[model samples]
Target: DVLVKWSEDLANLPSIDTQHKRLVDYINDLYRAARRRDMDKAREVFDALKNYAVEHFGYEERLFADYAYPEATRHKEIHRRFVETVLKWEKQLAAGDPEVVMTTLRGLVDWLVNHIMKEDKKYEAYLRERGVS
Candidate 1:
């Protein structure tokens, strides 16, 4: 289950939310590319995912800090871990390992659906409470 039917989970944070959704979409597309044995397409989308996800994650961290979010440090650590894992997996994919790519794709799907929606939502609530729109 690469895609979890999450159509409109914008959460309305404006800057990070849309990009996060795009990351999820790219991950889903990557899954399709992988299944199709389209390594070039997979690599291209994976590159896009790696680059954009880091930028979006940084933006999320910045917003949390700017809002003085209480769990800012811990949340940033989680974000860092997520980005690190993704980066490692992407490099492994580039190295041309089918198992690494498949397992990492599963991890990406799980992390995005669970971590982003639940854990990330916690901090987003903090911003919303502070009237950050």
Candidate 2:
């Protein structure tokens, strides 16, 4: 069951939507790898997820910079913590912990829900003010 939705509802910032969709895909792939109990494949998928997430996070932060988003620095702090948390889980995954994989998956799902419903609304408001429509 490949399932993850970064921003299916709530504020759908087109710029972020594209990248968010890719992250959801990566999460689904990681879930598949975990289900199959393939450590090597899981590791590869996990690394890919982390890499892409980092890339996307940076892309988001840079958008804030370009737009002079007032909370850009604060928002980036969230990105920084998210990366650190994910990397920690990756470390645990390398250590052969099934719980680590499950926990990470659950965390991702929760984070996605909160992120889209809450954090993204901020940008949506900004976009509206900028006449993005």
Candidate 3:
């Protein structure tokens, strides 16, 4: 029911962009389950997102470390809190809450809009200034 086009994706760095594309697909997959009213499948996909998102954030943070991005402090903390939010919902879904599926869907989409796009734009500009291309 939900899909993110390449046009909607981030394009700053290949590594982070690739990871985000995959994350969007996973969110889309979870959206599939939500539209089907299938909480269990979304739960499964949330688990995948939980693990995979953590890995992606870890990789992104490493890049920050590599470049010594000063904004990494806030960005990294936001990443931590995002995972905390995901893990909380992952458990709520497992607790057999049906309506929570759509709630989780909204959370994922909002994160894309709020954090992914917003924060990445800031970081992208920072990288561009340093000639990271």
Preferred candidate (TM-score higher): 1 or 3: 3
Better of 1 and 3 by lDDT: 3
| TM-scores, one per candidate | 0.83, 0.86, 0.85
Candidate 3 per-residue C-alpha lDDT over 6-75 given as tens digits, one digit per residue, 9 for 90 to 100: 5554666666778888888988898788778887787888899889989988987887788889988988
lDDT of each: 0.76, 0.76, 0.78
Q: Per-residue CA lDDT of candidate 1, range 1-133, in tens?
A: 3654555553556655677768878888888787777777888888888888888878877887788788889978888898888777777777675556667788888887777767777876678788875
How many clashing residue pairs appear in each of the predictions shown? 0, 0, 0
Give the winner by lDDT: 3
Q: Model 3: what TM-score?
A: 0.85
lDDT of 2 at 30: 78
Candidate 1 wrong stretches, greater than 4 Å = 7-16, 95-100
For candidate 1, what is the TM-score?
0.83
Candidates in order: C-alpha RMSD to true structure: 2.5, 2.2, 2.1
